Design a protein around this motif. Sequence first.
Motif, PDB file in Angstrom:
ATOM      1  N   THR B  31      -2.895   1.278   0.928  1.00 49.27           N
ATOM      2  CA  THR B  31      -3.319   0.434  -0.178  1.00 49.27           C
ATOM      3  C   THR B  31      -3.867  -0.879   0.353  1.00 49.27           C
ATOM      4  O   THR B  31      -3.215  -1.545   1.156  1.00 49.27           O
ATOM      5  N   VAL B  32      -5.056  -1.229  -0.094  1.00 42.74           N
ATOM      6  CA  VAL B  32      -5.718  -2.471   0.214  1.00 42.74           C
ATOM      7  C   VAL B  32      -6.244  -3.143  -1.057  1.00 42.74           C
ATOM      8  O   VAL B  32      -6.993  -2.555  -1.829  1.00 42.74           O
ATOM      9  N   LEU B  33      -5.829  -4.390  -1.237  1.00 40.95           N
ATOM     10  CA  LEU B  33      -6.278  -5.126  -2.410  1.00 40.95           C
ATOM     11  C   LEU B  33      -7.100  -6.339  -1.975  1.00 40.95           C
ATOM     12  O   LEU B  33      -6.927  -6.863  -0.875  1.00 40.95           O
ATOM     13  N   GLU B  34      -7.966  -6.739  -2.891  1.00 44.94           N
ATOM     14  CA  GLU B  34      -8.763  -7.948  -2.776  1.00 44.94           C
ATOM     15  C   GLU B  34      -7.850  -9.132  -2.477  1.00 44.94           C
ATOM     16  O   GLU B  34      -6.661  -9.108  -2.807  1.00 44.94           O
ATOM     17  N   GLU B  35      -8.441 -10.136  -1.841  1.00 47.41           N
ATOM     18  CA  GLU B  35      -7.776 -11.376  -1.489  1.00 47.41           C
ATOM     19  C   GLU B  35      -6.932 -11.883  -2.648  1.00 47.41           C
ATOM     20  O   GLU B  35      -7.424 -11.950  -3.776  1.00 47.41           O
ATOM     21  N   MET B  36      -5.675 -12.198  -2.368  1.00 46.77           N
ATOM     22  CA  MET B  36      -4.724 -12.640  -3.375  1.00 46.77           C
ATOM     23  C   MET B  36      -3.515 -13.272  -2.699  1.00 46.77           C
ATOM     24  O   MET B  36      -3.354 -13.132  -1.486  1.00 46.77           O
ATOM     25  N   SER B  37      -2.693 -13.953  -3.498  1.00 47.28           N
ATOM     26  CA  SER B  37      -1.453 -14.513  -2.969  1.00 47.28           C
ATOM     27  C   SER B  37      -0.315 -13.508  -3.125  1.00 47.28           C
ATOM     28  O   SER B  37      -0.170 -12.840  -4.148  1.00 47.28           O
ATOM     29  N   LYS B  70       6.457   2.432 -11.368  1.00 43.90           N
ATOM     30  CA  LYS B  70       6.943   1.404 -10.468  1.00 43.90           C
ATOM     31  C   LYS B  70       7.001   1.888  -9.021  1.00 43.90           C
ATOM     32  O   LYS B  70       7.473   2.974  -8.701  1.00 43.90           O
ATOM     33  N   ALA B  71       6.498   1.033  -8.142  1.00 53.98           N
ATOM     34  CA  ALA B  71       6.471   1.224  -6.715  1.00 53.98           C
ATOM     35  C   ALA B  71       6.848  -0.101  -6.052  1.00 53.98           C
ATOM     36  O   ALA B  71       6.631  -1.159  -6.631  1.00 53.98           O
ATOM     37  N   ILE B  72       7.403  -0.005  -4.883  1.00 55.76           N
ATOM     38  CA  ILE B  72       7.752  -0.997  -3.880  1.00 55.76           C
ATOM     39  C   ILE B  72       7.378  -0.509  -2.486  1.00 55.76           C
ATOM     40  O   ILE B  72       7.976   0.400  -1.902  1.00 55.76           O
ATOM     41  N   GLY B  73       6.338  -1.118  -1.917  1.00 55.47           N
ATOM     42  CA  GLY B  73       5.893  -0.682  -0.604  1.00 55.47           C
ATOM     43  C   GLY B  73       4.930  -1.667   0.035  1.00 55.47           C
ATOM     44  O   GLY B  73       4.816  -2.807  -0.417  1.00 55.47           O
ATOM     45  N   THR B  74       4.258  -1.195   1.081  1.00 53.30           N
ATOM     46  CA  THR B  74       3.313  -2.009   1.829  1.00 53.30           C
ATOM     47  C   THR B  74       1.996  -2.194   1.088  1.00 53.30           C
ATOM     48  O   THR B  74       1.397  -1.233   0.607  1.00 53.30           O
ATOM     49  N   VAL B  75       1.575  -3.453   1.012  1.00 50.31           N
ATOM     50  CA  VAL B  75       0.312  -3.815   0.383  1.00 50.31           C
ATOM     51  C   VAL B  75      -0.506  -4.633   1.377  1.00 50.31           C
ATOM     52  O   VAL B  75      -0.019  -5.665   1.841  1.00 50.31           O
ATOM     53  N   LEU B  76      -1.698  -4.136   1.675  1.00 51.44           N
ATOM     54  CA  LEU B  76      -2.627  -4.817   2.570  1.00 51.44           C
ATOM     55  C   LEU B  76      -3.597  -5.645   1.725  1.00 51.44           C
ATOM     56  O   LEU B  76      -3.891  -5.206   0.617  1.00 51.44           O
TER      57      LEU B  76
END
Lengths: 99, 99
Positions: B31-37, B70-76
């Motif tokens: 998973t890769v998301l756009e720039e965010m905090s 619901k998920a809890i995991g690695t986010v790029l």
Amino acid sequence: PQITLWQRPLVTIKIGGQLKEALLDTGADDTVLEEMSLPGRWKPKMIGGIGGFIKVRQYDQILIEICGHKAIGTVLVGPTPVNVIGRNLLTQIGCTLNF
Amino acid sequence: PQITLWQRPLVTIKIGGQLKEALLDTGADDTVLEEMSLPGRWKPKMIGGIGGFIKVRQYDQILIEICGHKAIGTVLVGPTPVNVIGRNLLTQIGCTLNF
Ligand SMILES: Nc1ccc(S(=O)(=O)N(Cc2ccccc2)[C@H]2CNC[C@@H]2N(Cc2ccccc2)S(=O)(=O)c2ccc(N)cc2)cc1
Ligand SMILES: [Cl-]
């Protein structure tokens, strides 16, 4: 078949008399394969993602077999790092996302 | 749900209390998301797209809801063409490919 995503969903395909391995990719709008010869006319196209864009050749109405399914579609051919089956052809085999 | 592929499989996700649109991508390992905090410390990660490898920021054990699941995991986090939900979280929501 129901295919798990614990691992990359890799399948074997037959195209242009050739057997290739390819990734079933719901994020790919188009099918894209590494350099190969295909019959018929083609036009240039640019496709992009992380890392940027590559130039490919767009071949239309190409016959492909994917898991015993015969389908017809567009194939982009170029220097891609990974062979993928995109939505344009996943739809033709009736492929869905399920959860 | 059962999601067909005539159009991009775009769904709504929630992360950091915010709703975003993301693409269900069986070709993306991660998973890769756009720039965010995001909270916490991050680690470096290289991911390979069609144009080559780029550096992204890796956040682990992040809470994220995908189409209600619901998920809890690695986010790029990085310059991705679109928010993509990759195999690491599609497995968590029990997603499979079927045809
Ligand atoms: N039209 C079109 C545009 C792009 C492509 S693609 O970039 O080759 N391609 C296949 C792929 C690349 C790298 C590894 C495995 C598969 C896309 C689609 N699946 C993942 C990949 N990408 C997502 C994407 C790209 C463009 C539009 C919409 C989404 S990506 O950004 O390269 C990528 C790669 C790895 C991860 N973790 C996340 C994202 C194919 C057809
Ligand atoms: Cl259908």
